[PDB]
Amino acid sequence: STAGKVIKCKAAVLWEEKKPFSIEEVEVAPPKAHEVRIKMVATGICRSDDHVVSGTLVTPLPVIAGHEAAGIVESIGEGVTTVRPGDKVIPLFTPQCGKCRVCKHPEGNFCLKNDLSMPRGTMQDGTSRFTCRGKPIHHFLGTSTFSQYTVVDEISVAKIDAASPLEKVCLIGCGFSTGYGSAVKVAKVTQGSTCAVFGLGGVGLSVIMGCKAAGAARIIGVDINKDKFAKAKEVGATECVNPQDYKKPIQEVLTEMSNGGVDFSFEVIGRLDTMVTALSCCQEAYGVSVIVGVPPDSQNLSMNPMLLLSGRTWKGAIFGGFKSKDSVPKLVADFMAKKFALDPLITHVLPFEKINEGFDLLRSGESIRTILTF
Amino acid sequence: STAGKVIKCKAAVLWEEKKPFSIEEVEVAPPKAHEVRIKMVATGICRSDDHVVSGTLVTPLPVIAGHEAAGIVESIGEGVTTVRPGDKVIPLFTPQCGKCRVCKHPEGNFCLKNDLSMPRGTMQDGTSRFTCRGKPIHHFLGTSTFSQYTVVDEISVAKIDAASPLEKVCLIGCGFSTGYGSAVKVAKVTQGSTCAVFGLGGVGLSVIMGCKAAGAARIIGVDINKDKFAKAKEVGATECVNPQDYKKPIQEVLTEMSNGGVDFSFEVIGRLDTMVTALSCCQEAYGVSVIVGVPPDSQNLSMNPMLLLSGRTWKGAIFGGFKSKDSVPKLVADFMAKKFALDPLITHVLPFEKINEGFDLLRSGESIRTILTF
Numbered sequence A, B: 001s002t003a004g005k006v007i008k009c010k011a012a013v014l015w016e017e018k019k020p021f022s023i024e025e026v027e028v029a030p031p032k033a034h035e036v037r038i039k040m041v042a043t044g045i046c047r048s049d050d051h052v053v054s055g056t057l058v059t060p061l062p063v064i065a066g067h068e069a070a071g072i073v074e075s076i077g078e079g080v081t082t083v084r085p086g087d088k089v090i091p092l093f094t095p096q097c098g099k100c101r102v103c104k105h106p107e108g109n110f111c112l113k114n115d116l117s118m119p120r121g122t123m124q125d126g127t128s129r130f131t132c133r134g135k136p137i138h139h140f141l142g143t144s145t146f147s148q149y150t151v152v153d154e155i156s157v158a159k160i161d162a163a164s165p166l167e168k169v170c171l172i173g174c175g176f177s178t179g180y181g182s183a184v185k186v187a188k189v190t191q192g193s194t195c196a197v198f199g200l201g202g203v204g205l206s207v208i209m210g211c212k213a214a215g216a217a218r219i220i221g222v223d224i225n226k227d228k229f230a231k232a233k234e235v236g237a238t239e240c241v242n243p244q245d246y247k248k249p250i251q252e253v254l255t256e257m258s259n260g261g262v263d264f265s266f267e268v269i270g271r272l273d274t275m276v277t278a279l280s281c282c283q284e285a286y287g288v289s290v291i292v293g294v295p296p297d298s299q300n301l302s303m304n305p306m307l308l309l310s311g312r313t314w315k316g317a318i319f320g321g322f323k324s325k326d327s328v329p330k331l332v333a334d335f336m337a338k339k340f341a342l343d344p345l346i347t348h349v350l351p352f353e354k355i356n357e358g359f360d361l362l363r364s365g366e367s368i369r370t371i372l373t374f
């Protein structure tokens, strides 16, 4: 009934850097071949969406940002085979074309069809489905979820359980999957292991959850904010450490605590000093450190390569290591089968029109995750 | 007949830093409990032995250095079960006590009984078996192979094929195993893969050999010295690249050459810039870079953590990843079963008394490996 026609709707457009989002009436073109138009039901606010505002995640402006979300398919273009009008879906900010050597690779997930490396802010065909009073508006990571309606390429969407609570499983579009995958997939945490998690916001809590699912015996939470500790223990942390309580460097504290270094450490805050710290506190011979967050305006870090020469392994990933379209549905299936709870991560829920408020909660540190509802 | 008594023999003592070795008459005490006295048959000259001379590998002086070697057991102390008078043996500069959590760990090989981390320059019991005119002389890495005779702890020795040519299989004590393991064990090079090897001295040639054994489809040799290229191709390299031939940075050249990055890269030269280069030239999503050499007087390197956030894996090891006592005999068995040739690495052979000459060949770059014969 709206199929094949322009939809007039509201979206949160960022017209310029360092400005609040403007709720604007926009037009959303019908989906072309192999494109999918989605009515949004919920979208989380992620740190990476704010990097667009700060200018640190360089991408074309004006933009409709947002990339952690869920909704319902409104319609499909020619040749779409993987979703149908009515399906519950999660947009995939990391695509899975299934053809490139990354998608072919049994370990790789950073599909070369991504728009993160060298952002164009378009659909795969190099155009935009968005206008604001006839002006073109750029897409973001092929998702653009801060809109009542969006069009994504088929390679950027996954069909999920028709019975999922979208207001919750939207977290699987970024924050949860990223954390949880870091443990379960990238690091491959083993049973009886000792883990250390640097940063206890939403993505850190999700690492803790993955470490617990993997059967870690000790999960050491590390953050300078004490108030973060209760929820960390509530989701699986055995102990919590505030570095400001100590007179010695924190990697020494953690090495002592773990009788000569942890099995797996995770940097989830995105700071250069804590990255090196995290690597050092893991056991010199067989320790693994995983880099989860970054600052997209990153300087270089400075590290001593002897930390690696003893036998350490240092690594990062995007989207928790997960091949996106393959994994998103099983993660929802797991939630549905109650293998893990998402409610501990949701601290604030706001209507979409109060997006700017939600970003204030994010910028201030007062929320773990704000979910916006359409 | 010498069992249980002091042996008077010659050794190459370094009395002070930055000095030539002095061939001195020394006394070698009989082995105590769980110690093994070995008559040396051959010893290679390694870059790490020279780091002792430069003062960059800090270890107590005066010292008898050397750690890549083979010989014949002269006698055994009380309770030695793993070798017997007459056995052909390789001293293990990385021990395998078999008890510590590293030796227990299915991936780790840097046994915590090592004397590399915080060198004491003793036997495990904290004493020395060496005197020079009654002055005590320090051990080195529990091996001290620049001596006609040495005493090692049982955890620092492995019994090998009674039919091995010791003049060749001595390379398995460091240089070969380190290179070969880096490919086969640490990186786990896969079939059809594209590999890049930065540095084509002895340890680099050994990486090439491991990559070929693993079934790599492309092995790209990288060195600034053209003269090194023939022997690289002779042992398995498909192509060779001199960065001085190019007008653009070498990681760009290698990324282009490999259609968007190599599967596995290896830094074998020990330079901070080439370490970062090596990591960058591997494929962003599933690339692995392995650090093989170091400079023990190392500054920090400077790198951008975004290189890891895409999906790269960065790692180092000691002794090629190999659990030493477990692996040394099978590596000799493999040589004996002709699964790989060691003669391509041996460019110079000298009597032990011309040790200083051999180090000159090493310092100058004129040899790939000098073997000293007793």
Ligand SMILES: c1ccc(-c2ccccn2)nc1
Binding pocket: A046, A047, A048, A067, A093, A116, A174, A175, A178, A203, A292, A293, A294, A318
């Ligand atoms: C934690 C860490 C990273 C990211 C991320 C990176 C790129 C694009 C979008 N989100 N999100 C949460």
Ligand SMILES: c1ccc(-c2ccccn2)nc1
Binding pocket: B046, B047, B048, B067, B093, B116, B174, B175, B178, B203, B292, B293, B294, B318
């Ligand atoms: C290549 C790279 C490293 C080493 C090494 C390191 C520590 C002690 C001894 N040898 N040898 C050859």
Ligand SMILES: [Zn+2]
Binding pocket: A095, A096, A097, A098, A099, A100, A101, A102, A103, A104, A111, A112, A113
């Ligand atoms: Zn792909």
Ligand SMILES: [Zn+2]
Binding pocket: A046, A047, A048, A049, A067, A068, A174, A175
């Ligand atoms: Zn995100």
Ligand SMILES: [Zn+2]
Binding pocket: B095, B096, B097, B098, B099, B100, B101, B102, B103, B104, B111, B112, B113
């Ligand atoms: Zn051990």
Ligand SMILES: [Zn+2]
Binding pocket: B046, B047, B048, B049, B067, B068, B174, B175
């Ligand atoms: Zn060596």
